[PDB]
Amino acid sequence: SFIPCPVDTSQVILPPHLEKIRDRLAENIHELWGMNKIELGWTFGKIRDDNKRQHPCLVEFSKLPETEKNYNLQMSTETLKTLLALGCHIAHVNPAAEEDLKKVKLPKNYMNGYKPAPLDLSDVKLLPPQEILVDKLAENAHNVWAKDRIKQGWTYGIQQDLKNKRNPRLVPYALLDERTKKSNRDSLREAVRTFVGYGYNIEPS
Ligand SMILES: Nc1ncnc2c1ncn2[C@@H]1O[C@H](COP(=O)(O)OP(=O)(O)O)[C@@H](O)[C@H]1O
Numbered sequence: 296s297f298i299p300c301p302v303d304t305s306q307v308i309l310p311p312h313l314e315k316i317r318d319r320l321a322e323n324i325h326e327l328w329g330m331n332k333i334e335l336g337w338t339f340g341k342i343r344d345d346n347k348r349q350h351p352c353l354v355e356f357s358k359l360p361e362t363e364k365n366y367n368l369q370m371s372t373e374t375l376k377t378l379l380a381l382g383c384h385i386a387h388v389n390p391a392a393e394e395d396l397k398k399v400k401l402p403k404n405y406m407n408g409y410k411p412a413p414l415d416l417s418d419v420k421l422l423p424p425q426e427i428l429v430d431k432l433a434e435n436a437h438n439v440w441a442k443d444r445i446k447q448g449w450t451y452g453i454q455q456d457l458k459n460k461r462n463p464r465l466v467p468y469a470l471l472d473e474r475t476k477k478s479n480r481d482s483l484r485e486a487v488r489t490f491v492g493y494g495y496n497i498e499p500s
């Protein structure tokens with residue numbers, strides 16, 4: 296059996312000036328999911344058929360249900376709140392941001408009206424201490440996801456099931472396939488690069 300216990304963010308709070316960056320981080324994380332699903336062969340619909348490859352939650356940020364969108368906004372908060380728990384703080388330095396950025400231009404077949412478009416964050420490099428940081432944050436994000444699922448009643452099986460709460464990935468990070476392990480680490484790379492793209496520096500407090 297496996298129990299997830301991430302780092303403690305219970306005593307920390309997020310200053311009001313950090314909520315502005317929280318809304319933009321959660322936006323760009325959604326466009327990456329739509330693109331990686333179009334690359335995986337999912338079409339559109341208003342009812343959910345796994346064999347037909349049609350799913351309703353492939354539209355813009357504005358029309359998703361309020362029940363589902365809260366999970367994304369809270370996990371954008373815990374990521375910024377966990378950085379304060381490591382003895383570091385983020386401070387805005389560079390004013391030449393928000394006009395120096397652009398979104399990706401994809402071909403016409405990625406389009407129902409909606410077409411995903413993440414930001415172009417490719418010429419943004421990190422220092423070693425910042426890259427060792429993304430290694431620690433990725434394993435914590437798995438533990439935060441793991442702790443919510445145990446409380447919601449989902450256990451481990453061999454086959455995922457929409458009628459019987461069950462998912463095969465209910466394992467420690469050490470018993471995790473590198474194909475999944477990587478995708479958790481790549482999500483934090485876009486998270487840290489999203490902060491630098493708007494002008495935030497990560498230093499000790
Ligand atoms: N790794 C992720 N990062 C951000 N948002 C995610 C992620 N995985 C799923 N979501 C969001 O969760 C919502 C519902 O997910 P859903 O389409 O039911 O996913 P799945 O079928 O893969 O479980 C979608 O709006 C999607 O954008």
Ligand SMILES: O=C1CN(/N=C/c2ccc(-c3ccc([N+](=O)[O-])cc3)o2)C(=O)N1
Nearest residue numbers: 320321324366367370371374437440464
């Ligand atoms: O099967 C699975 C799925 N999964 N990842 C769980 C996802 C679902 C959405 C989020 C999420 C993360 C970060 C932000 N953010 O920062 O904005 C917003 C939302 O975590 C996993 O680890 N094994």
